[PDB]
Amino acid sequence: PEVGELIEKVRKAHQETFPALCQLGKYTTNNSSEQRVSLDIDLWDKFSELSTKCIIKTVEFAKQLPGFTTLTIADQITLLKAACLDILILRICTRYTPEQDTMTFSDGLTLNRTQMHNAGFGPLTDLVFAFANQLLPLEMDDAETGLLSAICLICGDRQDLEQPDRVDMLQEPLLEALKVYVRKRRPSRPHMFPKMLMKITDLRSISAKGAERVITLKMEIPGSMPPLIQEMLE
Amino acid sequence: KSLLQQLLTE
Numbered sequence A: 001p002e003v004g005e006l007i008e009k010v011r012k013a014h015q016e017t018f019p020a021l022c023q024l025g026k027y028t029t030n031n032s033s034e035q036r037v038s039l040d041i042d043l044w045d046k047f048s049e050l051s052t053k054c055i056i057k058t059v060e061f062a063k064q065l066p067g068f069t070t071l072t073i074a075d076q077i078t079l080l081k082a083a084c085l086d087i088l089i090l091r092i093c094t095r096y097t098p099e100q101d102t103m104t105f106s107d108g109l110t111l112n113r114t115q116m117h118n119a120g121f122g123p124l125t126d127l128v129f130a131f132a133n134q135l136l137p138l139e140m141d142d143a144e145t146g147l148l149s150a151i152c153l154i155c156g157d158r159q160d161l162e163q164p165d166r167v168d169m170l171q172e173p174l175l176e177a178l179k180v181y182v183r184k185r186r187p188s189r190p191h192m193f194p195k196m197l198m199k200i201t202d203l204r205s206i207s208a209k210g211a212e213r214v215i216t217l218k219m220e221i222p223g224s225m226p227p228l229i230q231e232m233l234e
Numbered sequence B: 001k002s003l004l005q006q007l008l009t010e
Ligand SMILES: CC1=C(CC/C(C)=C/CC/C(C)=C/CCC2=CC(=O)O[C@@H]2O)C(C)(C)CCC1
Pocket: A050, A051, A052, A053, A054, A055, A085, A088, A089, A091, A092, A093, A104, A105, A106, A107, A108, A109, A120, A121, A209, A210, A211, A213, A214, A217, A233
């Protein structure tokens, strides 16, 4: 009932802030698509600017989530800074093309693995790619990817949350909505909901390696992190 | 009065 509406409201916040793979004009390039360097500066350039836009899109996604804007601004920032990397990893991995072994950005930009490495994923490249392959069997659509993101995001246990109790209240209908949604679409398979939940753990394992890449990276880039991206890690 | 905050109040 009220469940259906939540699913559809979360599906829309995801559809609208994150176009599907096939809605997109793909287009590659031949920059260091061959050899693994430490960093290609032209790759880094497009990628970093793209990422400022993702992060905006991810904030937009959050604001459209039931009840999220009722949290204190300070909570809203706390939750965001905490989950935002995770979300962007999920998001980009939803854009993987197994055949080409590629990933497509929201403007069409389509990078193979070596190129992904060279734009700054470096050590994380393989983990991201493995995760993306492990998603395929799950066959997730927009409502599932949206819900799963909302659940990573709306986490009662963040450090320094001013209203942990209220965050927890928010996250409960999300969990349920996903449970029932996944059951509908996949009755044959009952531990698919938990299988999905546990994907947040792989996101964590990868995003946690985040700050240490930020350091070794700050080194081989010319200027410094675009301001907004600075705000999300730092 | 921070990128994030402007993003969040607009
Ligand atoms: C750990 C770490 C990171 C972040 C890596 C990051 C932001 C990955 C997400 C990339 C992304 C955009 C995923 C899907 C979202 C979009 C697709 C698109 O076409 O545009 C949208 O932004 C660096 C860059 C490796 C160093 C800085 C700290």
